[PDB]
Point group: D2
Chain length 247, copies 4
């Protein structure tokens, strides 16, 4: 199938991806890079696609390089203001034989969840979000949670909906979660847990719940391979795995 290099291949993250390639039947693992060591090496080895996790300082450089030498790239490095997107967009004009994908999330379950919730939202009068995570976690609600809710809120504003039913005569502080474009979001910090979302939708007689659960820090990898196995047919720049999923 595909020849593949990895950048930042020695982090926690690196190793898991490294392995995932080897383990895969259809993907030949063709390089590895410390962080800032010599990129040339990709071409020498003839890599078709790279997976990048480099410090946002480096990232833009390797990007330019990869694009220049026709290599497509699957990026999960953070820090992409619309300036940086605009840089990349610019790098990519009239090539149509090379792609970039920037996935702020690679947890397919998470992604799919985001996706489906958007699709579902127009049919249910009620909709809330609940998010759960180990207690060490710095911020509440999770980013993912927040995005979910915004996306729901979108789907509703579009396809013009009201606000949702709630006959709560003066509720207790905290008790109805954080409002996020009118979507309640509840954050639960629980020793033993890892990372989990749960989106509930309500209508007459029924509910639909979509819930994602990560058991383990390495859930990104299936994401990344979906990227790698398909970037090859998504030239140019894409942001969000959702788009690679063909939905």
């Amino acid at each position: 199938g595909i020849k593949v290099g990895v950048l930042g291949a020695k982090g926690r993250v690196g190793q898991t991806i490294v392995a995932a390639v080897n383990e895969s039947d259809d993907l030949e693992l063709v390089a590895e890079i410390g962080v800032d060591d010599d990129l040339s090496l990709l071409v020498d080895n003839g890599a078709e696609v790279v997976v990048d996790f480099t410090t946002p300082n480096a990232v833009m450089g390797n990007l330019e390089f990869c694009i220049n030498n026709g290599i497509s790239a699957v990026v999960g490095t953070t820090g992409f203001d619309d300036a940086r997107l605009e840089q990349v967009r610019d790098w990519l004009e009239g090539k149509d034989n090379v792609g970039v994908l920037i996935a702020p999330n690679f947890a397919i379950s998470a992604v799919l969840t985001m996706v489906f919730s958007k699709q579902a939202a127009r049919f249910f009068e009620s909709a809330e979000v609940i998010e759960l995570h180990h207690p060490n976690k710095l911020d509440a609600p999770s980013g993912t949670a927040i995005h979910t809710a915004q996306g729901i809120a979108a789907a509703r504003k579009e396809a013009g909906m009201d606000a949702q039913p709630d006959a709560t005569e003066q509720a207790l502080e905290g008790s109805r979660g954080a409002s996020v474009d009118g979507i309640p979001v509840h954050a639960v910090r629980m020793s033993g847990m890892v990372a989990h979302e749960q989106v509930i939708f309500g209508t007459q007689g029924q509910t639909l719940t979509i819930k994602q659960d990560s058991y383990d820090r390495n859930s990104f990898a299936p994401g990344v391979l979906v990227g790698v196995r398909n970037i090859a047919q998504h030239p140019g720049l894409v942001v969000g795995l959702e788009h690679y999923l063909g939905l």
Copy 2:
């Protein structure tokens, strides 16, 4: 918005739908029929769309009639062999100002669940189904469960997948559910419960669960209105609400 009649309007089922119309802002309730009383009455009253729950003996007749006088119809009556579909198809040639919809299920949650599971299946190595229902229930697994699983199995055969990982050295009878095109399906009969599905998908590090829950015999109604509010832009014959949902 729309003028609407109902057939079989005195069953359990009828009443709930009757109300749902009135209650609705944009739908004028324009008739009611015992079961076999005179259909004429629809035209006299100038109905744009009907909702039908008649004994499968009657149904085909009212159908013909409705189509003949340009009225579109949302059918939840059972019993539609491909002969009967073929009848209807035939009734409908060169009209394109009239539709039928045949929804073997109107539980949106259920439908959406069916739908999303099909979309999700290609990404997860594991996938099982669990279905739960009050104990009175005659048959296991539920029809809905079975359909779900087949649809999953489809999505996998297409987008050619293997069978799923299961290192079970001689399992105990019953313990791994019923195989349904290679999809385990578990049926749970539980006093207090009503009707519920739950579809689990498994990959490295993660899961995605989609679960539908009906609290109440009347969950079909939101279905039916989605039908009514849209048949108007789906002339011809359609089978399955999934298609009205625009996904």
Copy 3:
């Protein structure tokens, strides 16, 4: 088994209990009362135990009466300040052939949940609560939720525990629920749902969740019969079904 009367037997509530008796093999249904009609009738009919749902104005009277004529009583009427308990306590001195039970909740699932959570709390560093209910509901969090949490908090203060791990650098308002004696409680209002609790406990490597679900306004009845079938061996005054359960 037992001869039984009912007071307030024509409310929504009444009917369900009425039936529950008949339906029961071991319980002969021996009376019915409008609300304030003549109690005498119990003795005439020779009732061993009554179930009472009368307006808190009446209740205390029928109580006195029942106790006076040796009839035991299962009360689910609200409004029992410690004054009123003290009244009843007083009514009951040196009888030991008659009981009262006052159950502020008769949902066994709910009760058991309350109970088990108290028992479990000492083993888990983390513990949160989530409560879900149809959107019509007036108050958040539910009473039941709040009680749960207090009871948890108790079990922890006793068996002296710390506060729980939460490294949340300035969380968003609402997002971590309402604090209730240091227990986060999340309230979710969701069309289609009825009444549900869910108590999560967290420790190294694991969780325990206990979740109660009412599908239907009549879940109190099993409560009430547990009462009736056992008051006979709990003379005096008891408050809370928990105590009848023999745990």
Copy 4:
């Protein structure tokens, strides 16, 4: 608090426990043993309690030894026919200053779950079990699942109950799980998951679900410390953590 040794302290298992001690404020870690190296060392170091994971060949020996020199022991080694229990019982006559605990399970969540299910079973007409585990797993249903169900079945036979409601006209093979003393048990193998149980109870209007979830191979450790922190007040032989929990 307590001085503590560990046997089999270099396995996967060992390390996690080692750490758990150090990390603990009130427990001084006072030894470590390869597997068969010299036990003397415990006394030299003055250990009050040991935690043992040795090959069932060794175990009985170290046991004898520990008991002989007054050291109490928390054992999670498998393989304890009633012969072996009888051995130990015999070792322990007239000491009452030393204990053993044999915990076939140390997952508190799991244990508590077992426990509560037994307590709950008498109140609900319906009761089923569902068990879920990574797909690598050799056997279905899990041991834990099976025990759960038996314990439920017990609690029912005692407190004489019927069989449960199920109007299933000829069900599909597999679909109603494995019968286990009349308790349906469903086994789900799901990539991404680890180890999980879920016990559902059903009555009129309601359910109670108790569900345990292990996220991680090390959930035994809280078990083990509950042991260690309490064996000191449970001289003699005990089998099952349930008994240390004081319920």
